[PDB]
Amino acid sequence: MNTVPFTSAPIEVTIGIDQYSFNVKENQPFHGIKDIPIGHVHVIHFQHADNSSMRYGYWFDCRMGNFYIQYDPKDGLYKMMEERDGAKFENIVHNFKERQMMVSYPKIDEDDTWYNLTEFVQMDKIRKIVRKDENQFSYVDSSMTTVQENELSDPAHSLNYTVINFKSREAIRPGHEMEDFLDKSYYLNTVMLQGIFKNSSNYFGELQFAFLNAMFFGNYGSSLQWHAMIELICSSATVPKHMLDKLDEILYYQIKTLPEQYSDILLNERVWNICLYSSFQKNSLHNTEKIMENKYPELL
């Protein structure tokens, strides 16, 4: 187990940790989150009560350091920091009075959801999408644009997702225009998988990261990326068999977790209708189709 101490909670806020969330009132005695499992990545996210504009948060790996949250009254946000002195942190965190002012990570044993949602997400790859090398943790917020969006305005504050653009020279071989536009297999297999991502794990990891950024922060560029990476697979006639099978599982857990009241804003009707009912891989997404149809029929 690991712990995320908060110096204080000076402003009223909704705090999320992985898929869980709770409220903290202004100046409430709150010193953080206890009982967090290791091994994965995590995300802690915030939305201020008095201004629900800007959701923001931090992706982090407890294995990489001792992290804590302190409110910055100048910048007006909860900031993640690393405590270099493991002895002071062990002393703050084993402090019995201190854990009386914290919330417990409430993992139900049957629940494998967070691993299911983050299996292929890795901090090292996150820190390549979110470029801030002085910190072991990565900040993301609701407003951040993607590099691809910027190419259509602060490069330091951008999500450096892999550019996926169906109408680009990268996606289309000269002499194979119709073929490659109607069947994205070249773009998926040769360009993206062999060329850029190197393997399907890195691809799925960015797909999962994009989804989670879209869901936790309402980050629109991340939503676009998630949908694009799904559509690229579904619109390919040739996809390894393990990838489709694994894709069905990945999407199923994403759709299952998605807030029911967030469907009008996090799901692109065109893309989902295409993937489920018109695409080469329509029949390879059995479990995703079933949860979509029985959870979001209005969209289909």
Partner: protein, 237 residues
């Protein structure tokens, strides 16, 4: 896009543009088979690529061999159109390459955009006008060269004949679209209007008769009358 409401004069400015109409690329006759079924036979078609400022028509003849052994021909036809339009642009010196290509049907956008990815500064867009370019094959000399082709062939025409010696491109385009709309609406009567005077002929190197300015005014009036008459007949007005 607009291209209407007093902003359609730009069509005839000095930025090079081409209209691309694919309506006559994939053409078929429909007949009954022996067993009783119905079968199509393809016939030669054409891509209609027009510079509205200069009247330069790039008529790419689509020979029926293009379709042999191919599936989903209506889809292929848009992609064949885009490949040929792209090839045309590439064949032209940079100073003659269009700044805009205006496709008459939205279905041509993606095939053309994809074939034109090497030309990022060429705008591709759907027309806002209803254009009668499908009636191009009612122009006898165009139909003749398409139906006689035994292979792929590009033929160049000035669809305005010598009119720009006397009128503006804006006026020529209006005359052209009036003629074509009349040919589309009542082809046999429009052709009789154009042939009413045996002493007024079509030059060997022209498509249209050699009307004087006043004769064109009369002809245009007759074409407008033809179009309005057909409207009345069709809608019982």
């Amino acid at each position: 896009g607009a291209m209407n409401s007093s902003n359609y004069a730009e069509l005839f400015n000095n930025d090079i543009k081409l209209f691309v109409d694919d309506t006559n690329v994939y053409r078929v006759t429909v007949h009954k088979t022996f067993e009783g079924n119905v079968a199509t036979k393809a016939i030669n078609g054409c891509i209609f690529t027009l510079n509205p400022k200069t009247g330069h028509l790039f008529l790419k003849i689509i020979h029926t061999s293009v379709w042999a052994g191919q599936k989903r021909l209506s889809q292929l036809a848009k992609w064949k159109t885009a490949e040929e339009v792209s090839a045309l642009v590439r064949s032209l010196p940079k100073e003659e390459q269009p700044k805009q290509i205006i496709v008459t049907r939205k279905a041509m956008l993606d095939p053309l955009e994809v074939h034109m990815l090497d030309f990022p500064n060429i705008a591709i867009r759907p027309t806002e006008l209803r254009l009668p370019f499908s009636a191009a094959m009612s122009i006898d000399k165009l139909s003749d060269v398409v139906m006689k082709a035994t292979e792929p062939q590009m033929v160049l025409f000035n669809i305005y004949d010598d009119w720009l010696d006397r009128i503006s491109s804006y006026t020529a385009f209006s005359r052209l679209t009036l003629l074509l709309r009349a040919l589309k609406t009542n082809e046999e009567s429009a052709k009789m209007i154009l042939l009413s005077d045996p002493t007024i002929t079509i030059k060997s190197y022209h498509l249209w008769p050699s009307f004087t300015d006043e004769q064109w005014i009369t002809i245009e009036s007759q074409m407008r009358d033809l179009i309005l008459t057909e409207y009345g007949r069709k809608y019982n007005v």
